[PDB]
Amino acid sequence: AEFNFVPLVSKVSHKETKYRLLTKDYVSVVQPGAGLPEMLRVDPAALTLLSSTAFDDVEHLLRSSHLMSLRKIFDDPEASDNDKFVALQLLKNANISSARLLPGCQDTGTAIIAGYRGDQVFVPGNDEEALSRGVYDIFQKRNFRYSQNVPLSMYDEKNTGTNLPAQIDLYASKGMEYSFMFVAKGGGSANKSFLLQETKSVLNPKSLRNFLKEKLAMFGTSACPPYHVAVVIGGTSAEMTMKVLKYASCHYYDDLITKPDMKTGYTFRDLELEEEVLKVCQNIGMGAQFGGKYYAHDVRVIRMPRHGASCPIGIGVSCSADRQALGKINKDGVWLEELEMEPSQYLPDLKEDELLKTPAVMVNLNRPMPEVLQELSKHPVRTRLSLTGTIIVARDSAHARMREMLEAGKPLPQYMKEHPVYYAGPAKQPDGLPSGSFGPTTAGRMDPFVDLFQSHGGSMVMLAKGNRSKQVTKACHKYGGFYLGSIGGPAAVLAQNAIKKVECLDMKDLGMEAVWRIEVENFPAFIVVDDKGNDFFEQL
Amino acid sequence: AEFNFVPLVSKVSHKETKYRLLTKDYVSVVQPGAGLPEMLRVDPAALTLLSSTAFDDVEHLLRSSHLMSLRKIFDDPEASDNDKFVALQLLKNANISSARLLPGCQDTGTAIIAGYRGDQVFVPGNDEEALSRGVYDIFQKRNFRYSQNVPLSMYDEKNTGTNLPAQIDLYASKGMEYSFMFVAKGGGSANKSFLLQETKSVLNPKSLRNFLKEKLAMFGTSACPPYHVAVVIGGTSAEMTMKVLKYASCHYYDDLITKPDMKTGYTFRDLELEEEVLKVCQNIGMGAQFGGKYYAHDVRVIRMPRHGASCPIGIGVSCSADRQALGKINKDGVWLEELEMEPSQYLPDLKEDELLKTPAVMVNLNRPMPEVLQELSKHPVRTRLSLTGTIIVARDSAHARMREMLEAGKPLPQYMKEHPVYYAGPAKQPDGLPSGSFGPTTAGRMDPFVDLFQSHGGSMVMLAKGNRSKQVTKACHKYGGFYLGSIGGPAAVLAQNAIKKVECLDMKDLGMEAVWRIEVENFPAFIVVDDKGNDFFEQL
Numbered sequence A, B: 001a002e003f004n005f006v007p008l009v010s011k012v013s014h015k016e017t018k019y020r021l022l023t024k025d026y027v028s029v030v031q032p033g034a035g036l037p038e039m040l041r042v043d044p045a046a047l048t049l050l051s052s053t054a055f056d057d058v059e060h061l062l063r064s065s066h067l068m069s070l071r072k073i074f075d076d077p078e079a080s081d082n083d084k085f086v087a088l089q090l091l092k093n094a095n096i097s098s099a100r101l102l103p104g105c106q107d108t109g110t111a112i113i114a115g116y117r118g119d120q121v122f123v124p125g126n127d128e129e130a131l132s133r134g135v136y137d138i139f140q141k142r143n144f145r146y147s148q149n150v151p152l153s154m155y156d157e158k159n160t161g162t163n164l165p166a167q168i169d170l171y172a173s174k175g176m177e178y179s180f181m182f183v184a185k186g187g188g189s190a191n192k193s194f195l196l197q198e199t200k201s202v203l204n205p206k207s208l209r210n211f212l213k214e215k216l217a218m219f220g221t222s223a224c225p226p227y228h229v230a231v232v233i234g235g236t237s238a239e240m241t242m243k244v245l246k247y248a249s250c251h252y253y254d255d256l257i258t259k260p261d262m263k264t265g266y267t268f269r270d271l272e273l274e275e276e277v278l279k280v281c282q283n284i285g286m287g288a289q290f291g292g293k294y295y296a297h298d299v300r301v302i303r304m305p306r307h308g309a310s311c312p313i314g315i316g317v318s319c320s321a322d323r324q325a326l327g328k329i330n331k332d333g334v335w336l337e338e339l340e341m342e343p344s345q346y347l348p349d350l351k352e353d354e355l356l357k358t359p360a361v362m363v364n365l366n367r368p369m370p371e372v373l374q375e376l377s378k379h380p381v382r383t384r385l386s387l388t389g390t391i392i393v394a395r396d397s398a399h400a401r402m403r404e405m406l407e408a409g410k411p412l413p414q415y416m417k418e419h420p421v422y423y424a425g426p427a428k429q430p431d432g433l434p435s436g437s438f439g440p441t442t443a444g445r446m447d448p449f450v451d452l453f454q455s456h457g458g459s460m461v462m463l464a465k466g467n468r469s470k471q472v473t474k475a476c477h478k479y480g481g482f483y484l485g486s487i488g489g490p491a492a493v494l495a496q497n498a499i500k501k502v503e504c505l506d507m508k509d510l511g512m513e514a515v516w517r518i519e520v521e522n523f524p525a526f527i528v529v530d531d532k533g534n535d536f537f538e539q540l
């Protein structure tokens, strides 16, 4: 018929989003000549202030709705004891990080910025560079982590030492506002954004539920649940499906129409599938990292148009580092989403000593490794532990380099054969404090090194977060080693309560990915893989 | 560690891109008051004309470099005979479609538009709506296909009848130019954009070579090779990796720095890996759809920075419908990339009879199917055929609706048991011509219907394009049916030379996805799966 323009996705409000005013500075309304409307001149320093403040706030603060979801776990009669134990560490973590000495997570993430500059906004300068200065500034000032590696070739890399580059996308809109979304996206949650190339034949109730049942297990516990799950069914391209997925997991689309109207847009939020997806998450068994009901806080499902030959599907999560802030600049100043500044009020009234039936088994790590293995071998998987002593810290790059050494005929470093290995990379150490945020790394990315290193007598006791592949279960059964699982997410509580001394041992060029040697007291862990073929997550 | 702004990706030239002028209309330079620089006013009709013209051209024309890669196949002593037979049909196809009666492919694709509106460009109107109108206008005027389905619910859908919505992304840049890239992205090549979530442990020559060998086979022949292959190693997010991959497969990044410089950007184009990837593709055995060397015309490899914990990898293809155009609007007018206006000069001087040594086997389809199955059963896979008679046409939505029928206790439609099945959806029929572009659709998306339908006596002889799953070998072996493969891509040659009558038989609500009944004469096809467990592609 006739031309009726309807956008692919309609414009969306954010009615539950409260903004705090940063300043009425930097902004002036001018009346240009020609046939032009009035314009909003914005000084570039306004962009620097907003991006630095926003990342300051998302690295230390959380949304009230998100904290409220963690607190609801304690009242739920169907939540497991481990669900509640995990949620409480994550609530204590928020209380600690609101003081702004320690960020919530050791991975202060990738800085993602999306701005929408209306045609009536004029900025006399370079937008990306002004936003990058704010990112640079705040990561320099706060006790954050430099996590970005730029390539010097295909295979050689260098940490930039500043957490740049930021990913900045500036879009052209209409009107007299500069709107923004800031995201501090952790790497492990970013690794769990998946694109599934599907077809029309999955687009029926029976097929889609069998599909989603299977695919939702792909996150595992590797992205620190409880999750904010998002699903995008359809899309006009793989890059559009994945962009919308990013937005949906940031809850950017909560106010989108929930029924097609063929008027304001072609894309809608499907409340019915969201409830079905939530139930599958509540029945998946993994719960909040160590068994239970709270795989997911909540779910977002967005249905887009598609080419007849296509049905791209996106699934992804926001992790327990749920870090995003809306912002905007208009003729009334610089505005930033208000996050929760009194997170202590979401802490439940209870003694943590009363949440868990059995007390932790205490393991002295400052023993000969055969002794430590002997003590661990007395306990079945699911056994909660409390660890005290020296630990060697190494993750992706240090493991990659040791594999090169082995392949060159060089021995595995001896410190790998004498201590447990904790996969982690610390954020910067605050003045006068024993440790920066120092939580655990995804254990599955190190699975290709386990059999290799244990065949050299190393990596016999591993401490990290997330479930692992069956090859690690077989390797530990083959050589008699252990995978100890930690709670992922509460890096500030660990830095404050458990990590007593931090030294850089080896591979110092790798920044945060260097080999560290740390002293811990009462570090919490569960036995996840034992020396007999048993895996926590294969049982239930 | 001083602040040194370096973009994620540098700005890129397009030095091999010649632009033709459409008009000096619609643009005026004005000098506004205040402290504002001179501005360029662009009438919204300029965006309508540019988008209308760009899509007119990409649907009918190709880049000269692309035609030359096809023509280079004929002088290559290592090109297979089928490589050349395929290349020749695609060269004839380009010659036909340059008349603008028939588009190169029946799938005129998803309309993708990316714009860069400079700070000094003002459009007194709605850019997105003006670009969609040009898309609307040209799909109405030319004999294109309406391919877009908007949801009425999660599972109910409707074709829009216009090929809207377009995917429009407008970025805010600086300066006095409005730059564009227009892409008509086929559904089948878009389905072969894959996101692989990898880690640092793949980032070594041996692992990355093992990884790429395995993953490059994922395209198969389902996206109508020879491909323009693109690979992106790294990226700051999944949506960025997939965005950059789209551009790289459009050859947008051809002028990118080929070595890191730590100044203009952090991303570079890796010529040494492009050379390794091309060799893997030349040795992969699938060739240009039916065995040979020309799986790939060429290769692009982009290396991006990454979070320490992440290595997203994108792989994708431009299909035989390699459809993109750069454009721009400035103070000197409306510009559009010049595509090849005389493709006939790229046809080799050779008789098509001289290319293949064994003649095609002629199969009369106007017989009882047991006769046709007996005739086809005389021949092994790879046997070239030439088919004449009646064929039923049905693909995705029509199969899904017949699967609904069977589960309800409704019989498989009788026409499915009486004729060969052609998976295809036609573009609009030109006035006074027997058929619109009417090439084949990807056969693998119908694999879930094969065993089901043959168990009801239907779909015994299938005609489509691309390799299929092992469950189709077993179903044809179980029930005694055949999958005959055709060359994908040259939909205009088929409409001109092979398709003699077209009728809509059933399911007319589904538009191009309705069930059709066509008469073909000398339609070429190869036996790809027979009634004995043999697969063309399981034997190289």
Ligand SMILES: O=C(O)C[C@H](S)C(=O)O
Residues within 6 Å of the ligand: A106, A107, A186, A187, A188, A189, A222, A223, A424, A425, A439, A440, A441, A442, B308, B309
């Ligand atoms: O880099 C880290 O510290 C942890 C990352 S965010 C992860 O694996 O989830």
Ligand SMILES: O=C(O)C[C@H](S)C(=O)O
Residues within 6 Å of the ligand: A308, A309, B106, B107, B186, B187, B188, B189, B222, B223, B424, B425, B440, B441, B442
């Ligand atoms: O939709 C079509 O006509 C064919 C698509 S592009 C495909 O399967 O390749």
Ligand code: SF4
Residues within 6 Å of the ligand: A105, A106, A107, A109, A185, A186, A187, A188, A189, A222, A223, A224, A319, A320, A321, A439, A440, A441, A488, A489
């Ligand atoms: S909460 Fe877990 S997944 Fe998220 S950034 Fe922190 S360690 Fe990574």
Ligand code: SF4
Residues within 6 Å of the ligand: B105, B106, B107, B109, B185, B186, B187, B188, B189, B222, B223, B224, B319, B320, B321, B439, B440, B441, B488, B489
């Ligand atoms: S050339 Fe093949 S893959 Fe590309 S749009 Fe046409 S039918 Fe689809």
